[PDB]
Design a protein around this ligand. Structure first.
Ligand SMILES: [Zn+2]
Lengths: 204, 117, 21, 71, 88, 74, 47, 188, 50, 183
RNA sequence: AAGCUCCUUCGACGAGUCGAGUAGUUUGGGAAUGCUGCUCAAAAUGGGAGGUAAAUUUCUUCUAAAGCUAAAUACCGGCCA
RNA sequence: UUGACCUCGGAUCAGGUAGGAGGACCCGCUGAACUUAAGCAUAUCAAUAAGCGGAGGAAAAGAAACCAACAGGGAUUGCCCUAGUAACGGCGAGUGAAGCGGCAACAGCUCAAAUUUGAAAGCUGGCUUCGGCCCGCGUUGUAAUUUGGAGAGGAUGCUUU
């Protein structure tokens, strides 16, 4: 019949392999992600603590330069960068951690849920490294973390932490220690009975 | 003992005087570059390793950090004022430490230092 | 040249000296 | 060999190379060493006349009777 | 030999090259937990749980190549068993 | 005849069937050369031809590859 | 949701690749023409 | 050669020099062996043989030199692989008290037990230990039988030829108090 | 045997209450930004020079 | 800290996670070309410690190399062959250094870090302007990479007498007859 | 911006790499002299190499698997003399 | 419906770069035979010649996972002796180093491993009135600080641009 291009065929075969292969727990827990409402609430507190764009930073710097031509509180923002966030987690300065589910290579993040659990910091897995990326002003963020917030948002951050902790970490504790994968469909199972009825009947 | 091709690997030193003149002119050129300064850096006195040669001293590579401190010469300034520094050598003996500090003090006494610019 | 090398050359530059006879 | 023969046979001029040296052989400038340096004297001779030491190392041979520059 | 006055030298960090980094130890333990075990380590774990400890040690030798390495691997896996038991 | 005019080297050395020059090997980018024939190497070494540009290089090196015109010219 | 249609399409494409790469020899074609099919593929009707 | 002559033995590869002489004992426990014959080479030039009964005592150290192993084409003799040998010892081995401790261990090492299932059923060789200098000389001989003239035993050397000089006997597997010191050992 | 066994948390089951690093905090984490001060000074010099 | 976490995870290779990832990638690389470009290092910690930066001028190439021997054994490794092939492909770049990524049973896989010497950022930045210098053309061909040094035995000690400071140079120095003017 | 000094504070160092088995090749060099391929495959008061009969494997000396660097050295070819 | 991210492509898109020659010396891959000696065989020729790949004015090597057993040395390179010694060889034909010591020259350094986190402070372009405008790269990490005979952070007082 028709012939697909090589890269399209390769990526669809990668889909089939990801759905078919039995996945180790450290990647199955990445397959488990959170939901629409919790993601939306996260990005509401977070969008208030988004970094300053480059134009805004230049405009601010020009403002103080002009002021000196013719005394501030500590800025609070969403902390991003893999090494920086890992350092914050290790030093227990992070209050919340959000990890993108689709970082390839995966090894960059595959230990992050375990590190967060060991250090006791609430963590969650978000669908979309491009979305964590849009909070910061970059194309992709593998991880973002909330360290401290303003007094106007302390209660909101605490309630978000409680909600994410319960409604995601309890389900993840129920199913994170087990293997993933094994979503064999009709064709896969039929091939399985074909293989067994061709193998164990008479000969090997 | 000529089983190999010594004829294609033979070397004749007809350029011995020419190389000597070249070396002497090289020592003259570095003296022209480093005019008031000597054309060599100060070297410490060390003991030869082997028991065959252990009763005679020679010139080592560079001065050690603790003897440099004892003589009172800063580490970052010693290569600047023309003293070789060796971070690998260790004293292990008050005799060598004292002899090298005496040498550095003699250099201190005989040295002329120009005040920057 | 690197900034660290520039700092080192700025604060410890090769001095002129003579050794007496 | 063929290149040199072609050079000798052709009318293109020979490119005589000036005796350029990478390093200057004598002190220059308007300082004491340059204004007291004798270009016809040797290194040890000049440093003996100046009163300065030219080598802090061990002597590798016998010096002139009046040499005082090889400590 | 000759009589020279002995001197005591300062501590060498290159001599301190031996790793006592508690943070490196933490990283190693967490990575062990995250990654899991090789098939031969799983076999050694099964043998150690069943009590074949001399067999485990022999198989560890056959897979690694040295008595000391086999001993260290067996000790590491026994500590993993103990930690799993006290965690369960 | 098994050897025609090679365009790269100019000799009557082009096997018509193989289409490869026996002297320089025209289809190959490299010019055929073997260390067991010093005579052939010295027949086709540099200096046996016209030397259009390599002959003019040394004067520019002697004057320092400078660009411009002498002051007060034209 | 389980990628069933995609799995069937990819399997069919790989099988077609196999048959053409095998039938570009004509000895495989002769063997296919001569060899007889089995009955454990027709099984299911009554037996 | 020694391992081939020993059927109740297990050959074991390089031992770490930074390891422990009693880690030798745990290794022997690992392999369920009650005797240890350890080869320790110094500078790649000199041999040292530690004979031991593990775990509790006693243990001797020999300096081993003057080696002439097998596959040296001047012996002309052979024997079955694993057959029980005849152990020949010396009157000095029975007289000196330390030579008596070394005889017992060499019996326990080269014993080749009677009912062992890897040993050969027939006897054809003799392993002889002799004391001439302050050293122990070991020889291995085939017993060839020749019909008498109107059978008689003849001996042809078959195997390794090495010289051992005793250094220490320790009470304990690879440690404990020193019971004997050569005090005349000239180290290479 | 179990080919794909569940992980037993023998290390993450215990929670540590202290940071890994005992290194002291620098002054810069408490004082305003010196780099931003340099940038503002460069901008002020540029505005002075027009 | 992610770099040490990755270093330990790479140390533990037959662990389940690394084995699974290596299997899937080995499949993906077999589906891909023999030599192809990478985007991002699959081993960022190894690339960084070997000298990879995320600058305009650094590129990765993954190369497949057939494993085995010629009973003759090739004195150059499969790692050096991969570097030489990647250089012949990208003749305009300098091969900085290569590292292992997958092995299967028929081919070994290597990611080669290469640097563009003609890029303005590379030329202006020190620490790499040395590779901008012309003496470093085809280090992989002259054996000047880490694999080349290892194969040449460029180590100091009594175990490397015949190979350090150049094997052929040492042989020539030992086989020259030196005759002086006064003999 | 930089150097030193002090300390009731810290101190991170290179993995299919070592190493074991094996085949080839190479060296004066089975403690395999080095290298390559192949199967297995590491450690953290660690690892490498030496010393030593001295009584246990004590002592001595360095940090591999990342990188740059002039000079003294070679030169039957290039510009000349 | 729309818009990002990732991957893979197109362009006679803008700017660059590689080929070939030379190869005396230099760095690698591959690699003989004639000859000599020995019952025979390994060996020797030779880790050479031929073939292939890659640079420069020098190349390479190079700042100890070194040498040593010292009362210690202290990156690399080359000359002298070491020395026809040690070692390996039917202890044949033979092959054949190195430490020390005297000398020539001497020069030291850069990264990965830590969070700038009170502010990506870094850099490629192309539009310029040459003064600064945007596009982008980049957090899966570009600057500064640090590189284990170290260092960092605080404190403290002098000294340098
Ligand atoms: Zn032609």
């Amino acid at each position: 019949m028709v012939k697909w291009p090589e890269y399209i065929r390769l990526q669809r075969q990668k889909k089939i392999l990801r759905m078919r292969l039995k996945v180790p727990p450290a990647i199955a827990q990445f397959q488990y992600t959170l939901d629409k409402n919790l993601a939306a609430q996260a990005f509401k507190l977070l969008n208030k603590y988004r970094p300053e764009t480059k134009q805004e930073k230049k405009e601010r710097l020009l403002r103080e330069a002009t002021a000196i031509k013719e005394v501030s509180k500590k800025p609070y923002t969403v902390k991003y960068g893999l090494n920086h966030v890992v350092g914050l987690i290790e030093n227990k300065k992070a209050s919340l951690v959000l990890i993108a589910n689709d970082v390839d290579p995966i090894e960059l993040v595959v230990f992050l849920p375990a590190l967060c659990r060991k250090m006791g910091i609430p963590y969650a897995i978000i669908k979309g490294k491009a979305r964590l990326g849009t909070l910061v002003h970059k194309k992709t963020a593998a991880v973002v973390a909330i360290t401290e917030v303003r007094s106007e948002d302390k209660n909101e951050l605490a309630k978000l932490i409680s909600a994410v902790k319960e409604g995601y970490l309890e389900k993840v504790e129920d199913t994170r220690k087990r293997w993933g994968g094994g979503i064999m469909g009709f064709k896969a199972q039929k091939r399985e009975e074909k293989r067994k009825k061709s193998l164990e009947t008479a000969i090997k | 003992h000529f089983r190999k091709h010594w004829q294609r690997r033979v070397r004749c030193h007809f350029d011995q005087p020419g190389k000597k003149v070249t070396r002497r002119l090289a020592r003259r050129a570095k003296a022209a570059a480093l005019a008031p300064r000597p054309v060599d850096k100060l070297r410490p006195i060390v003991r030869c390793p082997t028991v065959k040669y252990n009763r005679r001293t020679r010139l080592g590579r560079g001065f050690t950090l603790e003897e440099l401190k004892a003589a009172g010469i800063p580490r970052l300034l010693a290569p600047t004022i023309g003293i070789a520094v060796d971070h690998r050598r260790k004293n292990l003996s008050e005799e060598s430490l004292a002899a090298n500090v005496q040498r550095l003090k003699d250099y201190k006494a005989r040295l002329i230092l120009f005040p920057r610019k | 040249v690197l900034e660290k090398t520039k700092k080192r050359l700025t604060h410890f530059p090769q001095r002129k000296y003579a050794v007496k006879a | 060999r063929e290149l040199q023969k072609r050079k000798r046979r052709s009318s293109r001029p020979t490119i005589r190379m000036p005796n350029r040296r990478k390093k200057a052989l004598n002190p220059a400038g308007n300082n004491i060493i340059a204004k007291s340096w004798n270009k016809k004297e040797t290194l040890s001779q000049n440093y003996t006349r100046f009163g300065l030491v030219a080598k802090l190392g061990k002597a590798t041979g016998g010096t002139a009777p009046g040499n005082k520059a090889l400590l | 030999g000759h009589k020279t006055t002995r001197r005591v030298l300062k501590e060498r960090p290159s001599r301190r090259k031996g790793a006592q980094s508690k943070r490196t130890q933490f990283v190693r333990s967490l990575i062990r937990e995250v990654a899991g075990l090789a098939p031969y380590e799983r076999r050694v774990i099964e043998l150690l749980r069943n009590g074949k400890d001399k067999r485990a040690r022999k198989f560890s030798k056959k897979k690694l190549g040295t008595f000391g390495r086999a001993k260290r691997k067996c000790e590491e896996l026994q500590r993993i068993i103990a930690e799993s038991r006290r965690a369960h | 005849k098994t050897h025609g005019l090679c365009r790269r080297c100019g000799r009557r050395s082009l096997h018509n069937q193989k289409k490869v020059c026996a002297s320089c090997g025209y289809p190959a980018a490299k010019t055929r050369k073997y260390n067991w024939s010093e005579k052939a190497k010295r027949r086709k070494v540099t200096g046996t031809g016209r030397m259009r540009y390599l002959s003019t290089v040394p004067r520019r090196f002697k004057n320092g590859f400078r660009t411009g015109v002498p002051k007060g010219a034209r | 949701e389980d990628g069933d249609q995609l799995e069937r399409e990819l399997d069919a494409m790989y099988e077609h690749y196999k048959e053409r790469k095998a039938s570009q020899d004509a000895k495989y074609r002769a063997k296919r023409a001569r060899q007889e099919v089995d009955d454990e593929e027709w099984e299911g009707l009554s037996a | 050669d020694l391992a081939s002559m020993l059927p109740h033995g297990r050959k074991d590869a390089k031992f770490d020099t930074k390891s422990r002489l009693y880690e030798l004992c745990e290794l022997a426990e690992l392999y369920n062996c009650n005797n240890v014959l350890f080869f320790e080479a110094r500078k790649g030039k000199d041999l040292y043989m530690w004979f031991s009964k593990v775990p509790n005592g006693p243990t001797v150290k020999f300096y081993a030199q003057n080696l002439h192993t097998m596959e040296e084409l001047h012996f002309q003799g052979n024997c079955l692989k694993g057959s029980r040998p005849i152990l020949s010892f010396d009157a000095a081995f029975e007289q000196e008290p330390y030579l008596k401790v070394i005889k017992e261990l060499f019996l326990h090492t080269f014993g080749v037990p009677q009912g062992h299932k890897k040993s050969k059923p027939f006897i054809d060789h003799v392993l002889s230990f002799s004391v001439a200098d302050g050293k122990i000389w070991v020889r291995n001989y085939e017993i060839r039988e020749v019909e008498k003239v109107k059978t008689d035993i003849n001996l042809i050397e078959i195997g390794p030829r090495f010289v051992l000089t005793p250094i220490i006997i320790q009470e304990g597997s690879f440690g404990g108090p020193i019971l004997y010191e050569n005090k005349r050992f000239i180290s290479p | 045997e179990d080919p794909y066994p569940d992980t037993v948390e023998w290390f993450t089951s215990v929670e540590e209450k202290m940071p890994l690093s005992a290194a002291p905090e620098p002054k810069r984490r408490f004082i305003p930004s010196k780099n931003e001060a340099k940038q503002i000074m460069k901008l002020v010099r540029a505005i002075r020079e027009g | 800290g992610a770099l040490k976490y990755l270093e330990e995870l790479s140390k533990k290779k037959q662990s389940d996670v690394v084995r699974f990832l290596l299997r899937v990638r080995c499949w993906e690389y077999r589906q891909l070309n023999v030599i192809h470009r990478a985007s991002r290092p699959s081993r960022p910690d190894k690339a960084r410690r070997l000298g990879y930066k995320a600058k305009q001028g650094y590129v990765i190439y993954r190369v497949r190399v057939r494993r085995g021997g010629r009973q003759l054994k090739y004195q150059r490794s499969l790692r050096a062959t991969a570097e030489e092939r990647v250089g012949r492909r990208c003749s305009n770049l300098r091969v900085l250094n290569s590292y292992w990524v997958n092995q299967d049973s028929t081919y070994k896989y290597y990611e080669v870090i290469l640097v563009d010497p003609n890029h303005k950022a590379i030329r202006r930045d020190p620490r790499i302007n040395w590779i901008c210098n012309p003496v470093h053309k085809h280090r992989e061909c002259r054996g000047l990479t880490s694999t080349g040094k290892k194969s040449r035995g460029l180590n100091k000690g009594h175990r490397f007498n015949k190979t350090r400071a150049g094997r052929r140079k040492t042989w020539k120095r030992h086989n020259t007859l030196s005759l002086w003017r006064y003999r």
